[PDB]
């Protein structure tokens, strides 16, 4: 990769936290820190869970009524965004945003209410549904 991706973790100081022993669902509440690598998140509620027999295939969501995300993007095209929920996946590109979802980068800005983004990158997509599921 580069170097630093296992010196700086996701760090979480917290008040109203819980950590399960069995499936290992985790939740933080009321006051929560979230920073990692070159990224910051702000939230009142944070959750992390593991669809993982293998590791780093963990999934995280953050809620700040609205939550916000901030990224010093590698290539000199930094980005930040805001939504009722924000989401990330720990072996993966993908961020997703829902409820009043807004993002702005050197490449583009978008308002919508259901938007996906790629942390390695400068590209975004909105998914205007009509029962397509």
């Amino acid at each position: 990769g580069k170097t630093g991706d296992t010196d700086q973790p996701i760090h979480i100081e917290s008040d109203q936290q819980s950590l399960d022993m069995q499936g290992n669902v985790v939740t933080f509440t009321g006051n929560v820190v979230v920073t990692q690598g070159t990224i910051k998140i702000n939230a009142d509620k944070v959750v992390v869970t593991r669809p993982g027999n293998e590791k780093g295939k963990e999934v995280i969501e953050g809620f700040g009524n609205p939550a916000t995300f901030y990224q010093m993007q590698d290539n000199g095209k930094p980005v930040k965004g805001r939504a009722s929920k924000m989401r990330y996946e720990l072996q993966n590109d993908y961020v997703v945003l829902t409820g009043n979802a807004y993002l702005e980068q050197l490449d583009s800005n978008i308002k919508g209410d259901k938007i996906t983004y790629l942390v390695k990158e400068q590209k975004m997509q909105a998914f205007s549904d009509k029962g397509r599921r």
Binding site: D5, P9, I12, E13, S14, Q17, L19, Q36, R50, E58
Partner: peptide
Amino acid sequence: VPITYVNRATXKCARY
């Protein structure tokens, strides 16, 4: 990246 969280009731930490 790893996750590394700290609990109010011990002031000390774990990985995930």
